[PDB]
Amino acid sequence: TVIPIQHIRSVTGEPPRNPREIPIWLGRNAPAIDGVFPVTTPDLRCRIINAILGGNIGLSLTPGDCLTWDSAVATLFIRTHGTFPMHQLGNVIKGIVDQEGVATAYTLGMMLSGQNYQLVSGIIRGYLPGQAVVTALQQRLDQEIDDQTRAETFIQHLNAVYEILGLNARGQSIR
Amino acid sequence: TVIPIQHIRSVTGEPPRNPREIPIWLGRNAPAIDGVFPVTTPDLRCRIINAILGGNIGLSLTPGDCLTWDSAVATLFIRTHGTFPMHQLGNVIKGIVDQEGVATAYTLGMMLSGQNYQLVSGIIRGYLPGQAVVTALQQRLDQEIDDQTRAETFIQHLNAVYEILGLNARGQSIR
Amino acid sequence: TVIPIQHIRSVTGEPPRNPREIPIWLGRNAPAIDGVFPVTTPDLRCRIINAILGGNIGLSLTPGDCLTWDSAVATLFIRTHGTFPMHQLGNVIKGIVDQEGVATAYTLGMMLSGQNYQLVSGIIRGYLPGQAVVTALQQRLDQEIDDQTRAETFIQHLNAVYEILGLNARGQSIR
Amino acid sequence: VIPIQHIRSVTGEPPRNPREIPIWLGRNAPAIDGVFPVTTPDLRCRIINAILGGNIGLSLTPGDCLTWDSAVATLFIRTHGTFPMHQLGNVIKGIVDQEGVATAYTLGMMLSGQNYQLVSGIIRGYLPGQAVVTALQQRLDQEIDDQTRAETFIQHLNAVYEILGLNARGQSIR
């Protein structure tokens, strides 16, 4: 098939000039692309990403690297920053909860970490937006069964608590 | 399918950057978008809404949210204002009347509240432009059968009463 | 049934801000609109007009008001200038006669008036080029049998008189 | 002969500013019901008209005195000029600062025709402190249905306030 690239490329806009800014820009603009043209297979995700980023032979992915949008955004992260050691996962995540907030940072941290729920849960508990959140979120995760259900229910609970207290995603009050 | 996003995005234009102006922006382009393309299934509402919002943070919808234009417009309110829309319907209606006019504020009024003629009718009757109009408009709406008949014939009547007195949608004299 | 709004805007341009300048802009650009995408019913004409004027609820039309590109134009002029705006209709016509000439002033005036032969006829007869034309034109239109027939054979007779005297469209000589 | 003086001892003299007469009647209504039993709409109309003394402007007829809520709501339209539900959020915000959350729930429900969802949502925004909002919601969520939550809201607020050392007006011991 031929893909409607001129339309996709009018909805997203030009990708930023600093290539360290590219891997998060692609996460923000994913739902838009799925709107214009529903992306079903890894192939079609690759075809779409490769055309948008144009002349960068640097950042060209294959079908292996992009099963899901979250794989692509991680692969593109490792290239533009470099693989870093365990003790530096702190400064990567804090840097992101400041720009995009906890839900983005949890999903990327769980991906740059080989799904280490005990590590990435622990780090995110220091950058939550006030003590009353830290405590309310804890109780919900606590009364789950094991760590595997806690990993898959995290963002559900985070947002439920953020709703009650009436915060936006960036984690600031809007009332 | 593929949605005709080139066209839909000409009716609509580019969205406001102040992100608690968005539910009212999408609220008053919804009637036009439905003319230029038949949006039937919640999957297509979600696809269209997500395409025309572009790269904005926390503001993609799910097909769960987008069952009716109302439900969507209420959900984008909750994620921006923090509160439910129907805990401040008064302040929102008054704010629109002052910029856009009665017939605008009536329309968004019954999106936000959820087609509650009684309440929105009563909040508007407050902000009509002069005592004379209020009495005029009332005797037309008292000669319909049901409150179902009155919620179709409300703009038709306001537009007839404004002709007689010589006012101009935004509620200023032509004379 | 996708109404191709992007193409229609490519030909007409963007409508003005000051909504007093909309009813004439729509009459002028009408035969272009209709060449890109040919309308057939009132239904479609409504859907096209509302989509062009965009997110404007105040100047929204219904199928009732759109039997013809003239009926639509007339309805908008009464919402913006009010009924019996005879000093303003005097002023919009005098303006055109100077830029365009009398055969253009006639058709735009008759469109904005709801095809009011008696009113517009009267206004134009004060802006013709000199006493001899007025008298020559009148003698021809008086031989005609009813007012429907005068409105049909007005641009016809004005041309015949202008040709004899050796004037061009703008009422300046070519001898 | 209706025993007006016992009712006058509990209530007191009406407030001078016409705008605060509707809230005053709502706060004094539960105490009047305990001291003297009111069983008919007609008896209620005679008691309210005597308590306000000679106010011909705010006189109520037997039809609008069916329930204490209907009487308080009618006085609001005569004193302010707008129906209450149109501006409920502002009215609840005024009562919370002057009197407290418990007064706002009782008077907010009388003006809102017993709507739990609207009153509970408006009050949650003005509750004192983030901890109070989270603790109260957990207790209310356990209850089986909206009717049961409505009956136990004041009891569950008093328990949370006692644990966090807050007075009725929400001022901390620290």
Tab-separated table of C-alpha atoms in Angstrom, chain A residues 4 7-8 10-12 28-29 31-32 34-38 99-101 104 163 166-170 173-175, chain B residues 1-6 9 20 46-48 50-52 54-58 60 77-84:
chain	number	residue	atom	x	y	z
A	4	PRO	CA	-0.917	9.318	3.029
A	7	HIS	CA	-1.559	14.615	5.384
A	8	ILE	CA	0.271	13.008	8.385
A	10	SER	CA	0.614	18.503	8.029
A	11	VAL	CA	-0.950	17.373	11.388
A	12	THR	CA	2.372	16.730	13.235
A	28	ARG	CA	3.292	13.535	22.062
A	29	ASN	CA	2.381	13.304	18.323
A	31	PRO	CA	-2.215	9.769	18.785
A	32	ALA	CA	-2.543	12.376	15.990
A	34	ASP	CA	-3.156	7.117	14.527
A	35	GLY	CA	-6.079	9.580	13.870
A	36	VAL	CA	-5.135	10.512	10.276
A	37	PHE	CA	-4.136	6.910	9.361
A	38	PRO	CA	-4.651	3.885	11.692
A	99	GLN	CA	8.852	18.456	31.140
A	100	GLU	CA	6.052	15.835	30.659
A	101	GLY	CA	5.084	14.483	34.173
A	104	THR	CA	5.278	9.685	30.572
A	163	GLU	CA	-8.543	13.454	39.675
A	166	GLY	CA	-7.967	17.984	40.907
A	167	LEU	CA	-4.501	18.231	39.234
A	168	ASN	CA	-3.601	18.306	35.477
A	169	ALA	CA	-1.011	15.875	33.946
A	170	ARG	CA	1.957	18.220	34.512
A	173	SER	CA	-3.628	22.465	40.445
A	174	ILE	CA	-6.091	24.085	38.004
A	175	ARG	CA	-9.053	25.033	40.342
B	1	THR	CA	-11.293	4.087	6.130
B	2	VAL	CA	-9.256	7.372	6.069
B	3	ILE	CA	-10.824	10.654	7.412
B	4	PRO	CA	-10.663	13.723	5.068
B	5	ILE	CA	-8.485	15.726	7.543
B	6	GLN	CA	-7.395	18.347	4.833
B	9	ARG	CA	-9.233	21.254	9.359
B	20	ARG	CA	-8.740	26.255	29.033
B	46	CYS	CA	-12.233	10.206	18.696
B	47	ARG	CA	-10.107	9.937	15.454
B	48	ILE	CA	-11.256	13.393	14.271
B	50	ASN	CA	-7.372	13.625	18.227
B	51	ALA	CA	-6.262	14.671	14.682
B	52	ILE	CA	-7.473	18.359	15.022
B	54	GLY	CA	-2.406	17.789	17.337
B	55	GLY	CA	0.574	17.819	19.796
B	56	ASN	CA	-1.010	18.967	23.125
B	57	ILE	CA	-0.206	17.149	26.429
B	58	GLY	CA	-2.792	14.921	28.234
B	60	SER	CA	-5.966	12.899	23.499
B	77	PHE	CA	-13.506	20.499	30.306
B	78	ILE	CA	-12.771	18.118	33.272
B	79	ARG	CA	-9.102	17.663	32.128
B	80	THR	CA	-8.519	21.483	31.875
B	81	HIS	CA	-10.754	23.266	34.469
B	82	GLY	CA	-10.239	20.402	36.997
B	83	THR	CA	-13.858	20.637	38.233
B	84	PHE	CA	-16.920	19.086	36.503
